[PDB]
Design a protein around this ligand. Structure first.
Ligand SMILES: CNc1nc2c(CC[C@H]3O[C@@H](OC)[C@H](O)[C@@H]3O)c3nc(N)[nH]c(=O)c3cc2[nH]1
Ligand SMILES: CNc1nc2c(CC[C@H]3O[C@@H](OC)[C@H](O)[C@@H]3O)c3nc(N)[nH]c(=O)c3cc2[nH]1
Ligand SMILES: [Cl-]
Ligand SMILES: [Cl-]
Ligand SMILES: [Zn+2]
Ligand SMILES: [Zn+2]
Lengths: 373, 373
């Protein structure tokens, strides 16, 4: 039987790595893309379809599930896996991003964060409660409860925020370890903060490594800083993390962001872009994104992408999908989403294979030349 | 190879019949239920899923497709079957119901009907244009262009409407026959009108039989008359139609309506109820409909129906589907719709098998006793 957690690196090229994470519920091929399913569903897809696209793991969120249908309720019903019908690993975010994004709904203290408004209803999160919710969900990869520092941030505020997150990281560690069933069957990842500042990123990495985690996320990015800045921060931040554990870049991203992040040592990704923008009519192709709503696609018999191996591209035309999306038809959302998630997984497969073969640098160059032609 | 059209009756019980319609694109088992897909999609289902539920044929609509994406456009793209990815028979309604339902948008004459409002855009239908559109779509069963008489109607107005429909039926016949490819590969059904009046129903049946059609629809019902009245009209109306051709009751209906209509000699049905009410949270079960939104289902681990063989009932709980529908999630619509269409197809299968075995009367009684308990 598989271990609780084992990350193995099979091949490297520069800072890029490819390998596997073995967990009780399955193997995760890295670099990995995690489709997002905040409401216990990857929007518009059956779990079998998510799996058919090549996904090894999906992401859920403590915050959303706490509100609906409720953490205790999901536990009573047998856990998140049984509830939604996905039997493979699930990573759950801790709510720490919502601490920032929904801050106007919040009262924050060193103890935790209380969210208000069911109208005006209150829900509390803290390192202890976040870890408890993730246990109730039966999460396989549990994220520490942090605060995603807003961007931009002054060095003083970035430091204060990061320092609180490191204290919360220790509390997350202790809460996780104190629950035997969780400690024995799930993994716990810490989240590096520090905004765009090298010294704070170093302090955060050191604090997290001292505590010790199964994996290390780079938090606090993909919050409006832009690719140049994000890459600049990754350049110094990723090498600060333990080399022998997975590196997870939260919230990234567009295909080119993913490629560049892998070039900088990232092993795991999540983003709503393929799902959300899919429902909005944006389809990813090897020649760049297209908006299927555009009148130029109304009689285009080609598939969304000329090479894509997904079921959507095997069967339906751009013209049909154009019609569906224009008409607001549910099947439009379904087909766009399946194709985009499949595209993302094919991207990850090409990345993995090219690293394994020592030709990732060439792949990255070729990918960019064509995607941005 | 299969014929253009051959209806064979394999077994009978009272007025009920079971058999097959063989057409070039496939065999239709009767009594048959046709899922509705007005916008070139059965809402929230891939065609493969529609087929997996047991559907042999689906319904499209001349009116909706004329407006979006356009009949000529669909023809240019290779026809409706290729466009939407359903390779089996498709029946297309003629627009005659919309002549009534959208009458405030219309100017009507003996020549046809023009619909207004793309803002204020005009679109014309007539027997000739309706049949032409259905040809452009590549419909397998073409419906005559009629007018669904509003309900209630005075005998005078019902007569005038019916008489116009019979003139339009002859024009539909001639338009269909004048197009060699259509005449050789598709079938044409006439539509009986006459409101709730026996003498007008008889005149309409006689006119249609004199013209001659491949099948005969009972039109002008399921327009607010209620089951008692609908059944009363079917009691005298269905025997007026040629016995050796299919009898299609347009717009019906709830499960009990279908059972009673089969008891009265109906072979084919269409209705948006399982799809539309599915998206609205109504699930059909052998113990009657339930509304999955109801709080009583929030922690109910049972499938939607205890006996249903559909994929949804094999995998997901009422509690999960309750959550999805409450959350407005697309997967909620998908799962409810697949289950409801599967339920309807299982109903049709039970009807067919019971007629084949000479125990349909018993089935109808048992069905009603449990469904309305
Ligand atoms: C988009 N960029 C981005 N996403 C981020 C997320 C996930 C949001 C999570 O919240 C939901 O999206 C709003 C989804 O479930 C998503 O996985 C983050 N989560 C934590 N705990 N800490 C961060 O510093 C953080 C930074 C992010 N930057
Ligand atoms: C609901 N009851 C009912 N439906 C009916 C339809 C189909 C509407 C068609 O229009 C669309 O639904 C509005 C769907 O495509 C549907 O198949 C009818 N069509 C014709 N041509 N003539 C009728 O007398 C008629 C009567 C109906 N009664
Ligand atoms: Cl999404
Ligand atoms: Cl519908
Ligand atoms: Zn594709
Ligand atoms: Zn079912």
């Amino acid at each position: 039987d598989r271990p609780r957690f084992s990350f193995s690196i099979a091949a490297r090229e520069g800072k890029a790595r490819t390998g596997t994470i073995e967990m009780k519920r399955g193997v995760i091929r890295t670099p990995a893309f995690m489709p997002v399913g905040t409401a216990a569903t990857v929007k518009a897809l059956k779990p079998e379809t998510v799996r058919a696209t090549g996904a090894d793991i999906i992401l859920g969120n403590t915050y959303h599930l706490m509100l609906r249908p409720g953490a205790e309720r999901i536990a009573k019903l047998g856990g998140l896996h049984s509830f939604m019908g996905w039997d493979r690993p699930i990573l759950t975010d801790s709510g720490g991003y919502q601490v920032m994004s929904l801050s106007s709904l919040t009262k924050q203290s060193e103890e935790g964060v209380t969210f208000k408004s069911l109208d005006g209803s209150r829900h509390m999160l803290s390192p202890e409660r976040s870890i408890e919710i993730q246990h109730l969900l039966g999460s396989d990869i549990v994220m520490a409860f942090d605060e995603c520092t807003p961007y931009p941030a002054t060095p003083s505020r970035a430091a204060s925020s990061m320092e609180r997150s490191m204290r919360w990281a220790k509390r997350s560690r202790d809460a996780f370890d104190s629950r035997k069933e969780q400690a024995e069957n799930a993994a716990l990842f810490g989240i590096q903060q520090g905004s765009v500042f090298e010294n704070l990123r170093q302090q955060s990495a050191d604090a997290l490594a001292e505590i010790g985690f199964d994996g290390y996320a780079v938090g606090g990015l993909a919050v409006g800083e832009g690719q140049d800045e994000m890459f600049r921060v990754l350049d110094f931040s990723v090498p600060m993390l333990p080399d022998d554990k997975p590196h997870y870049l939260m919230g990234v991203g567009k295909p080119d962001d993913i490629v560049g992040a892998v070039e900088r040592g990232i092993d795991m990704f999540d983003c709503v872009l393929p799902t959300r923008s899919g429902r909005n009519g944006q389809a990813f192709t090897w020649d760049g994104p297209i908006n299927i709503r555009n009148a130029r696609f109304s009689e285009d018999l080609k598939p969304l992408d000329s090479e894509c191996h997904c079921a959507v591209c095997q069967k339906w035309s751009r013209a049909y999908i154009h019609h569906l999306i224009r008409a607001g038809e549910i099947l439009g959302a379904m087909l766009m989403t399946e194709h985009n998630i499949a595209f993302y997984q094919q991207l990850m497969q090409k990345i993995r294979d090219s690293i394994s073969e020592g030709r990732f640098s060439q792949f990255a160059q070729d990918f960019r030349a064509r995607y941005f032609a």
